[PDB]
Structures are given as C-alpha cells and as structure tokens.
Design a protein around this ligand. Structure first.
Ligand SMILES: Cc1cn([C@H]2C[C@H](O)[C@@H](COP(=O)(O)OP(=O)(O)O[C@H]3O[C@@H](C)[C@H](O)[C@@H](O)[C@H]3O)O2)c(=O)[nH]c1=O
Ligand SMILES: Cc1cn([C@H]2C[C@H](O)[C@@H](COP(=O)(O)OP(=O)(O)O[C@H]3O[C@@H](C)[C@H](O)[C@@H](O)[C@H]3O)O2)c(=O)[nH]c1=O
Ligand SMILES: Cc1cn([C@H]2C[C@H](O)[C@@H](COP(=O)(O)OP(=O)(O)O[C@H]3O[C@@H](C)[C@H](O)[C@@H](O)[C@H]3O)O2)c(=O)[nH]c1=O
Ligand SMILES: Cc1cn([C@H]2C[C@H](O)[C@@H](COP(=O)(O)OP(=O)(O)O[C@H]3O[C@@H](C)[C@H](O)[C@@H](O)[C@H]3O)O2)c(=O)[nH]c1=O
Ligand SMILES: Cc1cn([C@H]2C[C@H](O)[C@@H](COP(=O)(O)OP(=O)(O)O[C@H]3O[C@@H](C)[C@H](O)[C@@H](O)[C@H]3O)O2)c(=O)[nH]c1=O
Ligand SMILES: Cc1cn([C@H]2C[C@H](O)[C@@H](COP(=O)(O)OP(=O)(O)O[C@H]3O[C@@H](C)[C@H](O)[C@@H](O)[C@H]3O)O2)c(=O)[nH]c1=O
Ligand SMILES: Cc1cn([C@H]2C[C@H](O)[C@@H](COP(=O)(O)OP(=O)(O)O[C@H]3O[C@@H](C)[C@H](O)[C@@H](O)[C@H]3O)O2)c(=O)[nH]c1=O
Ligand SMILES: Cc1cn([C@H]2C[C@H](O)[C@@H](COP(=O)(O)OP(=O)(O)O[C@H]3O[C@@H](C)[C@H](O)[C@@H](O)[C@H]3O)O2)c(=O)[nH]c1=O
Lengths: 292, 293, 292, 292
C-alpha cells in the first residue's frame, strides 16, 4: 500500500512576477492546472491516497481546486511548508501521513509523458523494498542531481548540482520509497545550500545496494516548467498532442474512470458543470467511446 | 481635462475551465508576466494614472496582492467588484463614484495591444475632450464582436453586436474612451436578450449624436485577446518572439512609469532589488543606464 | 530482409504557394529536412535498402540531399511518380525494386515519435507473414482510412474517408507487407477519387485474416505535416524535445552509428563538414558520450 | 525611380542539413516562401524593377517561382553570386542592372512588419540623395553592424561585429542608396573576414555627412530567419497575425493590386489556379471587400 506526496510549494522568485499572484503549480499548462499533471502521474501509479504540500498561503487555493478527492475516487490531504528547505523535508512534514506505508514523492511542476509510462510507474510502484528513481538525458545536468554509471550501465554515484557533471543523466522529480525514507530523512543535515537533500536520501539507499535507477528513455517527455520559455513550450507540447489525438493529457476524471475508481454515473455528474466547454464535452464523450 | 481609467477584469472563464478554476484568467501569464499587465500598460501609455480595477468578488484580493495600491509605480489603483458578469457597460455603473466628473476610459483585462505609434494613437484619443473614441480592427471572426459598418467614404455609420451576418470584418476592440456622458448613458440601458448591458448600446448612443469617433486600427497593430487556450498560447508566443529579439520587454509597468517620469531612478532601482535574481529584475536595472529610443 | 519505400511525391497544391519551389518533403521540420523523419522510421525498423519515390521534377533534389546512402550505411534508390495516383501505386512503381522480399511503405511527410517505438517497429518488421498497420486515435478520422473494431477490440473493417466514421482510429501512413502486396496492387482498380487505395490493399489482407492492426497508443506521437499550422506545431514539438534533452530526433548519422551500420571513424568524417554548426557538433559529441 | 535588389544567395552552412537541398530563401515562413517577405518590402517601397541575386545553382528555381514579374506588374531580373563574398558584392553584380538610378538592397531572409512601415519605406525611397538605413534595438548587436549615437541621438560611427558593442542598435538588412554606391563598392577591399562589407559602404556615406540613420522602433518587427529557432518563431509570428486578422502578410498579389500595378481582372486570373486553397480563396475575397 503506497501513499503519495506532491510537493507543490517552493518560492517562485525566479518566474516572478508572473508567479506573484499565485503559485506556479496552479498555473495552467495549456488547458489545465499544472498540478494536474503530477497528480495524474501518481494516479497512474495506482496511488489513491495523496498528501499535497505547499506554502501556507496557497494551501487554501490548492484545496479550493482539488477538494478532498472523493469526486475522483481519491483521498487528498493537505499540509504546509512554511519555508522551501529541501525536497527531503517533504518526508518530515509527511511523516505521520505516511505512517508505516511505502510512499512516493513527485514534484508539483514536473510533467511526464510517454508510451507505457503506466507500466513504468507500475513496476516502480510494485517494488516492496528499496527505492526507485529515474534518470533522463538532458541539456544542463548541472541544474540537477546527476548520476554516474559504470561501464555496464549500472549507477555508481550521485552528485547534486556538480560543477562538472559526470554524465548528462539527471534524476527526475519522481521518487518511490519503502519505509526507510522517513528515518533517513530524520538524520539529514542541511547542505551548504541550506536544504535537506533528496539526493542525500537517494545516496543512502544507493550505499546499501537498494537504490534502483531506471533510465527514462528519450522517447518519454520529462518537462519541468522552470522557466517562462519552458512553461511556454510545455503548454505547446500538450496542445500539439491534444489537438491531433482528440484525447487529453492528465485529465483526472478520465484516469479515475479508466481505473474504475469512479463509475459512469459519477463521471456524468462531474461533466455537467463543465458541459459548456471543451473539457466537459470531452468527459461526456468518454462515456460512449471505447478508447484503447 | 483629466482622464480616469477602468480595467474590467472580472468575468467567468467558464469556457477556459478548468484552467481558470483556481485563478482568474487575467492573472495568468502571457509569456513572462501577468495578463493584466498588458491592458494596465495600455492605460498607462494613455497618460492615465488613476485607475479602477474591477473583478469578481472572489479574485479582488489576488488582484490587490499583485498590484497593490499603485503608489510603487506612481499610480493610484482602486478596486471594485462585479458579482455577476452582466455586461461591459456595468463597469460604468460600478465605477460611477470613481469616475465622478472626469473623462474616462475602459479597457478589457484580457485584451492585448501592440504596435508602432500605438502611444500616439492613445495620445490622440486621450486628448479629445468630448465625445467618445473607439477602434476598429480587421478580424477573422467579427461575428464574435460588436461590428462596424462603414459608408463608401470610410466613415462609420452603424454598429451591431454579434450579428448573424456581419456587414464588415471590422470589430470594435475592447478599448474605449468616453467623456462625461457615459455614466448617464449607462444608467438608462436595458439588458439585451443576452441579458447584458451592452457597450455597443453605449457606443451607438454616442454615434447617434455625431459624437462617436471610430478610428481604424490598421493591420500593422496587434490586437490579441486571449480567449482560448490556443490564442493564449499564441499570444505568449507572440510576446516571447518580440522580447527575445529586441532585448526589450512588452508591457512592463516599471519601465513605463519610469519613462513617463512617474517614478525616478531611485524608485526604479528599489523596485528591481527584490527581482534581481531573475531576468525581469535584471532588465529593470539595465534600464537605468541605457538610452532606449 | 525487408525493403523499404518512402513515398514522397504528391502534389502540395493544398500547400501552395509555400511549396511552389520545392517538394513538401524537403522542407525542414525545425532543424532537419522532413524526409529525415520517416527515413529514420525505416532505419529503426532495421531496413537498409530503400527506394525513394517522388515527383520527376524533385528526384534530383532528393538525390542531392541523401545520396546513394553509403554514407549512412544505406542503399538508397530512386524512382519517380509522374502523377499522384495513390499510395498503392508505390507497389507498382516499386515492383522490381521489391522483387521477392518483404517490404514496408512509409509516407514522406509522416512523423512518428515515442518510447519503445523501435520495439514497435521491430515486431512488425520481423513478422514473416501478412501485413501490419497501425491504428491511432485522432480528431479527424474522416480524413483517413478509418478502422472498425468489434467488442473485443479486433479489427473487422476499413473505410477510406467515410462520411460517418465508425471510430476515431485512423490508419497511420506506415505499412509492412509480405509478398502478397504486389500482386494485390496489380489487381486494384481506381476508386471514384481516381486513386489506387492502400485501404483496398489493407482490406485484401483483412479479408483473409492476414491483416494485423496494432493500436498505436496516445503515448506516441503521429504527426503529419499536412497543413501550415500543423507543420508549425510539428517543428515546435521537435524543438521542445530537442532543447530539453540535448539529443536530436531523426538524425540518420546517429541511428546508423547506434546500429553499427557505420563506425566511429565514419561518424567523425560525417561531422567534419558540419563542424561549424549544432548538427555537426552534435555528431562529434556522440563519439564520446554514452547515450542510453 | 529606384531599382531594387534582393540578395538571396549565401550559404546555409549554419542551417544545414535543413538547407542542403534548397536555398533557405525558398523555404516557407508559415504559409508562403520566405523570399516573398522582402519582395513585398520593396514592392511597398514602390519599387517595381528588381534584380534577384542568388546561388548559381538555385536561380532556376527562383525564376521558376517568381517568373519575369509581369504577372504581378513587376519587372524581375536575375543574377548570380558564385560565392558569398559580402553584401557589398551585390552592387558589383548589380552594377549594370542599376545603371544611373537610385537603388535599394534588401536581404532575402529578412522579414519586416509594422504599422506605417509603408510610410517609413516611402520616406526613404523618395529621398533623392545619400543613403538611408535603419537601426533597431536587439539582444545580440554583436552579430551585426552596430551604430553609435551621440547625446543628441545622432549617429556618429559604425562597427561591424564588434566584440564590445557601443549600443544595442543593429543596422537592419534594408538599405537605400543614391548613385554613389557602385563606385564606393568598387573601391572596397575585403575585410579580414574576407568579404566586401556593407558597413564599409555605410561608413563611406557617413564620413561625408550623407548617411541617414533612422531608428526603427520597438513597435516594428525585424526578424531574421537565421536559425532554426528563429525561422520557427517567425513562422509563428506570421501565423498568429494571419489567423487573428483574416489578412495575410507579404502576399504580392495583394500589394500589386492595392498599388494598381495589376487590375481586378488580373487578380482574378492569378487566383484561379490557387482556388482550391486558402491562399487562392483569400485573393478572391480581396476582389469584393474593402480593406483599409
Ligand atoms: C527546496 C524546495 C523546493 N520546492 C519546490 C519548488 C520548485 O517548484 C521545485 C524544485 O525546487 P528546486 O530549487 O528546483 O529543487 P532542487 O534545486 O533541490 O532541484 C532538485 O531538482 C530535483 C528534480 C533533483 O532530483 C534534485 O536532485 C535537485 O536537483 O520544487 C518545494 O516545494 N519545497 C522545497 O523545500
Ligand atoms: C536511438 C534513437 C532513437 N530515436 C527515436 C526513436 C523513437 O521515436 C524515440 C525513442 O526511441 P526508442 O529507442 O524506441 O525508445 P527509448 O530510447 O525512449 O527507450 C529506450 O530506453 C532505453 C533506456 C532502453 O534501454 C531501451 O530498451 C528503450 O526502452 O526516439 C532517434 O530519433 N534517434 C536515435 O538515435
Ligand atoms: C461581460 C463581462 C466580461 N468581462 C470580461 C470577460 C472576458 O474577460 C472579456 C470579454 O468578455 P465577452 O463576453 O467576450 O464580452 P462581450 O461578449 O461583451 O464582447 C465585447 O467584445 C468586445 C471586444 C467588443 O468591443 C464589444 O462590442 C463586445 O462585443 O471581458 C467582465 O470582466 N465582466 C463582464 O461583465
Ligand atoms: C516605451 C514603451 C513602449 N511600449 C510599447 C507600446 C506600443 O505598443 C509599442 C510601440 O511603442 P510606441 O511608443 O507606440 O512606438 P515606437 O516606440 O515603435 O516608435 C517610436 O519610434 C521612436 C524611435 C520614435 O522617436 C518615436 O516617435 C516612436 O515612433 O511599444 C511598451 O510596451 N513599453 C514601453 O516602455
Ligand atoms: C497593404 C499591405 C501591408 N502589408 C504590411 C505593410 C506593413 O508592414 C504593415 C502595415 O501596413 P502599413 O500600410 O505600413 O500600416 P497600416 O496598414 O497598419 O496602417 C495604415 O493604417 C491605415 C488605416 C491608414 O489609413 C494608413 O494611413 C496606415 O496608417 O503591413 C502587407 O503585408 N500586405 C499588404 O497588402
Ligand atoms: C496520393 C499520393 C500522395 N503522396 C503524398 C502526398 C502527401 O504528402 C501524402 C498523403 O497524401 P494524401 O493525398 O493525404 O493521401 P490519402 O488521402 O490516400 O491519405 C492516406 O493516409 C494514410 C495516412 C492512410 O493510411 C490512408 O488510408 C489515406 O487516408 O502522400 C504521394 O507522394 N504520392 C501520391 O500518389
Ligand atoms: C490512459 C491515460 C494515459 N495518460 C498518459 C499516460 C502516458 O503519459 C500516456 C499514455 O501512456 P500509457 O497509457 O502508459 O501508454 P499508451 O496509452 O501509449 O500505450 C498503451 O497503448 C495501449 C493500447 C496498450 O494496450 C498498453 O499496453 C499501452 O501500450 O498518456 C493520460 O494522460 N490520460 C489517460 O487517461
Ligand atoms: C555575405 C552574403 C550573405 N548572403 C545572405 C546569407 C544570409 O541569408 C544573409 C545574412 O548574411 P550574414 O552572413 O548574416 O551577413 P552579415 O554577417 O554580412 O550580416 C550583416 O548583417 C546585416 C543585417 C547588417 O546590416 C550588416 O551590418 C552585417 O552584419 O545574407 C548572400 O546571399 N550573399 C552573401 O555574399
């Protein structure tokens, strides 16, 4: 039984002033709020119980937007992070939420897409021990935690924001942990940057041969909307997919319905209030179209 | 005389839902800054410093959170609320006491204007002391808008709102200049079948006294309205292209307030500090020591 | 041992005047010529021997661009289509090129991209019987040959450009055939439209229970650059992936090298002439970076 | 009476391999061939007699595309540049074409757009002495000939590709000359770069107080399609204007018709062949819609 966390806080000083009125994760990527995407990633992982962490000031808004989850077959909860002191904090804040269960962490501005991504999630999720993460070839590795591989393609070390990256493989912002993560987090000390580092967590698992690093191929999309230009591109990527296919990406109603977490009657009900527009119309259509 | 401005930034996004489920359209970014900044900037360029921002009761706080009282940019921003999107013309009823006995000007919060000499264009409308001024712009789908009919000499003779059969492809954009007759005109309007108070009815009133001036806004200008997911995309992109080629930014209030001497160098510096770690802040700093024509 | 054909003729009247001076297929999608994309598709299918069909007028230009193929480990050949009389014509024009081998046909303006697309291709290409095609959910199936599924998801019929589509599954423009296709194409009669229809070819296989229709999931991208707008989006989809990953899509030098059809020396030499730009720089970098 | 030259040769080494088969200036920007853009610029300046300069290899195609000009009321001629030895070369190659007339030069991959651009053109074109150029604020002036201003805003010097730009005003690729340009070009010596430099021409005029530098404001768009990314953006810019307005940019048929260089009958005739598509339909529509 794995629980999930979405870490949707952070300042956004960068993308100011665009993000001065509202956290980034509530801004739309093309046609729907950013947080939907990562939300849909956990859903696809088979996770239904989820803790949304954010700034004190934007929780309400997150809640306004997502409610308790029941309408989509979910159980959402909320927690607050007063200061953006490190991904790993998510586990301290989320400790009692997690209890004795396996868990998963995903960044609220991280957008993933691709063929068999669902199976990919499935495999990580279904592991009952250790940790799983993902490595993705990128242009500037140095921004992220970077992984080093030996000659046989096995991961052998990690370095956070190295001056000189040993590879272009970055650790994406999706993480699956077993019951060691809380305690590992509790023993962490702030790095010179001043944060509690997920890399440090990942390393701890790696130092006991329990970290599993799956390469995420160039066929998948891992987009993070870290800059105005990237925010733009992402919105576009999705618009492109959406207008060709006639299907939508990261639409929670659909996933819930496909997973049988809600039934047709429920889906109809969710659609009424959105009937005057594309989105509602899409949901209706889903009730009478087999989509493979 | 002096002119006050209104930015009507309420309205549903019901269309745009669910994107707009968490915040109002007008607070979403067009590329690199909040939408409302654009029309805000339009009024500023019109020489208008005293401005009333109308929005849904629920989003006023967030508008306020973003723009403050205006004093930082040498402006005076007030705020008001529109419980229900009952027509552009309601603005004047809502902003009656804000307007008082001055000339005014209404702009739509999701309307984006850009082009060479747009400043002189504003200047002219703004400096007219009587009557009203609006703008006509060739578009693909005039039927979505209030449409203007012209005689053989290019003089506007009629207006129809959302006609089934448009008499021309010239739409009235969402930027309007009025003298002191607008409030009363607005106070005598009855809702159309759509159920709204129609700015077109307002415009027609002025036209029916030979006091509506309709300036053609040529194809050289951009009038974009971010009405759909796609158009929102295109706009952001339209802006991104100009900005990355020029090294200048569109609709950046700090810059306009400085250029118009509404704030001084010291004030501009101080506005920049908090944003230094990023492009936006860096830009402001750069403006202190570069002559930009 | 399967041979490939790229059909890259066709008029672009629709696309005039943009394509008045040069065939559609030689226009760039973002940073390399459109034909490279489908070219890459066949390469990834394991196909090295390929016939490029085009208008009489533009062949020389296609030749000028791709050469005989030796440089990328291919054997490219050329043929001409005076008139755009149907996809199926490719098999009459290509009859002797094909001889007694398995084959595949891909449209020159069809761009495919996704995770495990290579395995997808592998499976279809290694089949030693019947035909394989792909079905993809789109917004305007009426533009294409549409497939009909029964309640167990098995294909039961096809209709080219139907007034009322039985489903939103369009048959993409990628086709794998066994030795039956030539004789089948030889007995086709022109449809009312005046063309020899691949749908009729697809149907012939279907009528014997030898047509395999694989669903291509929403995780893959099937884009076809059939309108100004879409050509735009496509270019932009590619740029988005390329600028995030630091990898390039459909870059034949790379694919050849990855498949060991050319060696590092060959790759170095291919890059020299392009050294003063990104494309060349990319090639070089491939010689010293492991890319998974 | 001024004559115009469009310089559309050059190497695309940078944009390889995209441009290996055809010259960039024959690729489309969104919905029509690039060269249409500059072509329209000259037309808007009231210039009807034009020399198109290009590689030896692509002239034929340029000619195929644009004809002798008579269909659009122009008089087009052609010449060739075996090697891209500098913008000033256009004047040696174009000497006899120019004879004793005033002239103008525009780059073939330079796209201009804006309100009252036509009047801007008119003013420069009607000057009967000296030279006129335009200065425009850009992000990367070091890529261009840069201009330096005094405290009154008067141009005082030019540097081509300066390590350290004195300003961010670049000299765009649009130039108007009186009868001194040829002889000035005739006495140029190749810079270290190995080209005859238009900046050197512009300086010659500047040294006699006969160079007029007009600032082209941030309201105008000066885009050059010098990189994959910018070629994209440009396409996008245009599509965005076009689909909002229902008017098209740089559509020679229209400009000629507006300037009374062709009459309605001729316009109809030009549209017939393109009737099945947007472009044609647009031309038709122009016959019965007043457009201010
Ligand atoms: C530090 C922190 C960030 N965040 C949010 C804000 C941003 O949206 C986003 C990331 O902040 P950053 O400064 O980019 O985190 P970061 O600089 O730690 O970036 C991380 O990138 C990760 C993907 C890598 O896997 C890590 O190895 C690390 O490189 O997440 C929080 O919500 N809370 C926090 O305490
Ligand atoms: C190798 C390669 C692929 N491609 C294209 C083909 C596909 O559209 C897309 C992804 O290619 P594929 O190889 O089908 O999938 P992939 O590269 O995303 O996935 C690979 O991930 C690797 C880590 C695993 O070891 C492989 O088993 C496979 O899963 O990229 C290129 O354009 N150029 C290339 O050089
Ligand atoms: C009606 C209304 C809209 N708005 C916001 C909603 C959108 O953000 C934007 C426009 O709303 P619409 O329903 O499209 O307005 P509209 O349907 O009144 O369209 C207007 O279009 C103008 C450009 C024309 O000049 C007018 O003639 C008129 O046609 O206005 C409000 O804030 N309050 C309101 O009462
Ligand atoms: C100054 C400024 C302008 N703008 C936008 C407003 C308009 O939409 C667009 C064009 O600016 P305008 O002042 O209308 O025109 P312009 O700045 O393109 O043209 C100017 O060219 C100058 C060199 C001449 O001296 C001036 O007379 C004027 O023509 O600029 C901003 O968004 N922010 C700003 O700070
Ligand atoms: C006429 C025309 C212009 N253009 C380009 C030229 C410029 O880049 C831009 C705008 O054209 P211009 O005519 O320079 O500006 P404009 O058309 O935006 O402005 C005109 O507005 C009119 C209402 C006024 O009556 C005119 O005096 C002038 O102000 O459009 C075309 O691409 N095709 C065309 O057919
Ligand atoms: C007909 C034809 C097209 N072409 C090129 C031109 C276009 O770029 C592209 C397809 O042209 P169209 O006229 O759209 O062909 P088409 O209308 O037959 O389209 C096809 O789509 C495939 C994807 C489906 O599998 C088919 O069932 C079919 O619908 O083919 C040729 O090169 N030669 C030809 O004879
Ligand atoms: C189902 C679904 C997926 N997605 C996302 C998940 C991925 O990013 C991408 C599609 O991912 P997947 O569903 O993992 O892969 P897929 O849908 O491309 O492929 C599927 O093709 C099917 C026919 C096969 O039977 C499955 O085995 C699988 O191959 O879309 C949504 O956003 N909404 C959805 O409702
Ligand atoms: C040099 C040259 C270029 N060209 C074409 C190729 C490109 O499409 C276009 C630009 O060439 P470049 O090598 O970028 O030119 P360039 O590097 O000479 O750039 C010029 O940029 C101008 C705009 C400035 O006004 C000049 O100051 C100068 O900087 O010129 C020719 O057709 N023939 C030639 O001899």
């Amino acid at each position: 039984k794995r629980k999930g966390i979405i870490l949707a806080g952070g300042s956004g000083t960068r993308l100011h002033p665009a993000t001065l009125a509202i956290s980034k994760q509530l801004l739309p990527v093309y046609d729907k709020p950013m947080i939907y995407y990562p939300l849909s990633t956990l859903m696809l992982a088979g996770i239904r119980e989820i803790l949304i962490i954010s700034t004190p000031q934007d929780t309400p808004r997150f809640q306004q937007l997502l409610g308790d989850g029941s309408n989509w077959g979910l159980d959402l909860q909320y927690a607050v992070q007063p200061s953006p002191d490190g991904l790993a904090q998510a586990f301290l804040i989320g400790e009692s939420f997690i209890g004795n269960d396996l868990s998963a962490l995903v960044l609220g501005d991280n957008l993933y897409y691709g063929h068999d991504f669902h199976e990919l999630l499935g495999s990580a999720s279904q592991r009952q021990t250790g940790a799983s993460v993902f490595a993705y070839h990128v242009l500037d590795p140095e921004r992220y935690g970077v992984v080093e591989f030996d000659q046989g393609g096995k991961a052998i070390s990690l370095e956070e924001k190295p001056l000189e990256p040993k590879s272009n493989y970055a650790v994406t912002g999706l993480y699956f942990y077993d019951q060691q993560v809380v305690d590992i987090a509790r023993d962490l000390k702030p790095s010179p940057r001043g944060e509690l580092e997920i890399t440090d967590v990942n390393r701890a698992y790696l130092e006991r041969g329990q970290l599993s690093v799956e390469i995420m191929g160039r066929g998948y999309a891992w987009l993070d909307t870290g800059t105005h230009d990237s925010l733009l591109e992402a919105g576009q990527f999705i618009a492109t997919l959406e207008n060709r296919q006639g299907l939508k990406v990261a639409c929670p109603e659909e996933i819930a319905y496909r997973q049988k977490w809600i039934d047709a009657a429920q889906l109809e009900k969710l659609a009424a209030p959105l009937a005057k527009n594309g989105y509602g119309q899409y949901l209706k259509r889903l009730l009478t179209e087999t989509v493979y």
